[PDB]
Design a protein around this ligand. Structure first.
Ligand SMILES: CSCCC(=O)C(=O)O
Ligand SMILES: [Co+2]
Length: 179
């Protein structure tokens, strides 16, 4: 199953796992209290998968494309991966389905402590509008992912602090309502 954990107190080498000691694993159930949802799919079938279609229709993920984060092939690579990793939020869901490779999504918990979520081939995640998060490659330095969106996408990150947005206010209101 999908692995998530609280992080250690080192700020060095962000692509390493940074597991807290002793281990403090985080379950899919705890992630749901943060509004973070997850599905496991057969990523070999991504071009034609009834199971992905079910999720997309349920959630109205009407838009998708594919992105490959590779030191060589990605245009403006160095600036892009810097922007992914700055703590930020969006006014829309961030939905990513890992087709190849791997990476980490870090998200803030209810006490603003970092949880690291390890995403691998087959893993699909949605980070709710308003959640503070960031993304980094892991030490394998490669990921290929499907991006999905509810309608035509707007990718704009708002780097923390971004507390004034309605999407953030509504998300805080959502957090009051979960366990
Ligand atoms: C695994 S997708 C690459 C990261 C990304 O697209 C983002 O942080 O917005
Ligand atoms: Co983001």
């Amino acid at each position: 199953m999908v692995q998530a954990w609280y992080m250690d107190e080192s700020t060095a080498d962000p692509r390493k796992p940074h597991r807290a000691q002793p281990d403090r694993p985080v379950s899919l159930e705890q992630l749901r209290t943060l509004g973070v949802l997850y599905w496991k799919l057969d990523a070999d079938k991504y071009e034609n998968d009834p199971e992905l279609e079910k999720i997309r229709k349920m959630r109205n993920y009407s838009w998708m494309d594919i992105i490959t984060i590779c030191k060589d092939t990605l245009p403006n690579y160095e600036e892009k991966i810097k922007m992914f990793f700055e703590e930020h939020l969006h006014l829309d869901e961030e939905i990513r389905y890992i087709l190849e490779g791997s990476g980490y999504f870090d998200v803030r918990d209810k006490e603003d402590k970092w949880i690291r979520i390890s995403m691998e081939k087959g893993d699909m995640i949605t980070l709710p509008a308003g959640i503070y998060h960031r993304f980094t490659l892991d030490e394998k330095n490669y990921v290929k992912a499907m991006r999905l969106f509810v309608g035509e996408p707007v990718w704009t990150p708002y780097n923390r602090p971004a507390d004034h947005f309605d999407a953030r206010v509504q998300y805080m209101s959502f957090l009051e309502g979960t366990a």
